[PDB]
Design a protein around this ligand. Structure first.
Ligand SMILES: c1cnc2[nH]ccc2c1
Lengths: 337, 20
């Protein structure tokens, strides 16, 4: 049963949530290989764990920069959640630690690259190719939401493709364990639900809205609301209007009208039937949810590899030092990390 | 076309998160 699987999952999660792992490695145990992504909100590197020779993705945050950006609690959320979860389409923390300058989160490496890269290159995905990825997100959100977690940053940039062509939902910087309503303005303009833009209290329904955005973007090759500046995007999102490409199936358009529903009473994922209004929709009729979860469905695209620690599916970024001060920074702020 | 309008826009690259 799904209910019963989730009950056991929650028991597993709560135990780790209430007693988080802490200080389970050291920077000197890893060989730094390459920057896989980078921004104001930190960076992610491929590293090699020397004791096992396993490759991992290592997120590095500069404690001082986190503080300046008011992301202290959000970062504590990220680490505390990611050490506790366990799901085929999430990369839980294998290790975390900190030093005088930085916070380190070490996770399973997905060598296939960001969905963003393949989506942009290829143009758009077929409806079946998109449905295969969407199915994985639906299951992940069912899992997360059952643990009272909201994700808050769905987009192809955060979705990594693994060796089998299945995805990992990465970057939990805005993820939060909340019962009831929350208020933080966060996420990415194109994927922001109207509630968020209009400064309302909001709930897990914003993730189901973001799903509508992702499915649209995957199938169309561009997002349903775009413009050159965020403010113009926000005007489109709250308008209540969306246009679909002529090639979108009838089933696809119907799913999306119900995901991209400005009215919370009518948004799929937020009705009394919850996620099953999505899972039982005609667009997913061919989807075997257990086969997806078990990862026995054949991926519509498997990525090119040329070995372990291959990075050819990732863009090249300027490589910056990992500096470690001789003075501890922000000790109290990140005491629990 | 909508595709052409997208490709000519400033937001075809990786998109940054926002905040207060
Ligand atoms: C790139 C590849 N694999 C990853 N796992 C977690 C984050 C991340 C980024």
């Amino acid at each position: 049963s799904v209910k019963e699987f989730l009950a056991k999952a929650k028991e597993d999660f709560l135990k780790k949530w209430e007693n988080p792992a802490q200080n389970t490695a050291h920077l000197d145990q890893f060989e730094r290989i390459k920057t896989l992504g980078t921004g104001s909100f930190g960076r992610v590197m491929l590293v090699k764990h020397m004791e096992t020779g396993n490759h991992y993705a290592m997120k590095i945050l500069d404690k001082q920069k986190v503080v300046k950006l008011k992301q202290i609690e959000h970062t504590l959320n990220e680490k505390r959640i990611l050490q506790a979860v366990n799901f085929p389409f999430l990369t839980k923390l294998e290790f975390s630690f900190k030093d005088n300058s930085n916070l380190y989160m070490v996770m399973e490496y997905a060598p296939g690259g960001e969905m963003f890269s393949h989506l942009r290159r290829i143009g758009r995905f077929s409806e079946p190719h998109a449905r295969f990825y969407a199915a994985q997100i639906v299951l992940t959100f069912e899992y997360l939401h059952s643990l009272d977690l909201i994700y808050r940053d769905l987009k192809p940039e955060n979705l990594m493709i693994d060796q089998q062509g299945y995805i990992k939902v990465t970057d939990f910087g805005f993820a939060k364990r909340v019962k009831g309503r929350t208020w933080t303005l966060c996420g990415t303009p194109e994927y922001l639900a109207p509630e968020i833009i209009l400064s309302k209290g909001y709930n897990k329904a914003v993730d189901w809205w973001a799903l509508g955005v992702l499915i649209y973007e995957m199938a169309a090759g561009y997002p349903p609301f775009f413009a050159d500046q965020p403010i113009q995007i926000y005007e489109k999102i709250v308008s209540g209007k969306v246009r679909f490409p002529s090639h979108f199936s009838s089933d696809l358009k119907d799913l999306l009208r119900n995901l991209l529903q400005v009215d919370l009473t009518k948004r799929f994922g937020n009705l009394k039937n919850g996620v099953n209004d999505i899972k039982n929709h005609k667009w997913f009729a061919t989807t075997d949810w257990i086969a997806i979860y078990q990862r026995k469905v054949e991926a519509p695209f498997i990525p090119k590899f040329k070995g372990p620690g291959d990075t050819s599916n990732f863009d090249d970024y300027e490589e910056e030092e990992i500096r470690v001060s001789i003075n501890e920074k922000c000790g109290k702020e990140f005491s629990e990390f | 076309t909508t595709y052409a309008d997208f490709i000519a826009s400033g937001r075809t690259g990786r998109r940054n998160a926002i905040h207060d």
